[PDB]
Amino acid sequence: SFVGLRVVAKWSSNGYFYSGKITRDVGAGKYKLLFDDGYECDVLGKDILLCDPIPLDTEVTALSEDEYFSAGVVKGHRKESGELYYSIEKEGQRKWYKRMAVILSLEQGNRLREQYGLG
Amino acid sequence: SFVGLRVVAKWSSNGYFYSGKITRDVGAGKYKLLFDDGYECDVLGKDILLCDPIPLDTEVTALSEDEYFSAGVVKGHRKESGELYYSIEKEGQRKWYKRMAVILSLEQGNRLREQYGLG
């Protein structure tokens, strides 16, 4: 089953995809999702991406601490003490981000559906 | 089609999996593979892993320049100038390896078949 898998899944209200885990197969193409911030909802498999981590060379949305965001390209992954970090490039400069600070816009996540979607 | 995809595929004679590209669908579950060292052969889809790069936390076989090899665990990926590098941990120490210096033993590659295999 897909239960227990870490995924990046669409939040319907805003169209962005966020890191989370599938917790239940709700049936008929629907899954219960526990997002890493603790929010839960049902999501269609077509809006769930099976990429842990988000792939190298993917355009993502990086989150700054003062609630700013920007596009960037994934140039590295690093594990440390069991936690995932992304190296993201913006204008030729790379910066590290924790897992929780990397999300996908509607357009960014849609690009990954054919290869990674559970549709 | 799977043609053009970078994969890690089994070399039948020795059981190890090596980086390469699918160049033809030979039919009936068989693919022509161009390995990164220039060798080509037909390989069964069940012996082809769709992981570019080989995943974080995977046990791999790292190649030293003087023809020694050892097991290690993938702890990072890095892109630089369009080339892929792996950070591999052995006894708590991490070392970088080019793509060509990371392969999978029979046992290491077999582990990845359920999630990544083209069988």
- Residue span(s) of chain A under CATH 2.30.30.30 come to 55-119
In chain A, residues under CATH classification 2.30.30.140 are 1-54
Distance CA A108, CA B90 (A): 36
Per residue, the 3-state secondary structure of B22-80, as one string, reads EEEEEECCEEEEEECCCCEEEEEHHHEECCCCCCCCCEEEEECCCCCEEEEEEEEEEEE
Non-local (6+) Cβ contacts of B104 within 8 A are B8, B16, B17, B49, B54, B58, B60, B61, B112
Token readout for A31 is 């899954």
Question: Resolution in A, one decimal?
Answer: 1.5
The minimum CA-CA distance between B79 and chain A, rounded to whole Å, is 5
Residue A57 with chain B: CB contacts under 8 Å? 79
Closest CA to B91 of B68, B62, B65: B62
Nearest to B104 by CA among B21, B13, B10: B10
| Residues 6+ positions from B42 with CB-CB distance below 8 Å | B26, B30, B31, B32, B33
> Which residues of B fall within a CB distance of 8 Å from A79?
56-57, 75-76
Q: Which CATH architecture has domain B1-54?
A: Roll (2.30)
Q: Do B76 and A75 touch (CB under 8 A)?
A: no
Please give the torsion angle defined by the CA atoms of residues B99, B104, B108 and B112, in that order, rounded to the nearest 10 degrees: 60
> Which residue(s) pair with A73 in the sheet?
A59, A89
Distance from CA of A55 to the nearest CA of B (A): 9
Compute CA distances B24 → A30, A61, B1, B44, B71, whole Å.
Answer: 36, 36, 9, 12, 32
Which of these, A50, A39, A52, lies nearest to A13 by C-alpha position? A39
Contact A40, A83 (CB under 8 A): no
Fold of the A55-119 domain: SH3 type barrels. (2.30.30)
- Contacts B79 to A, Cβ<8 Å: 56-57, 75-76
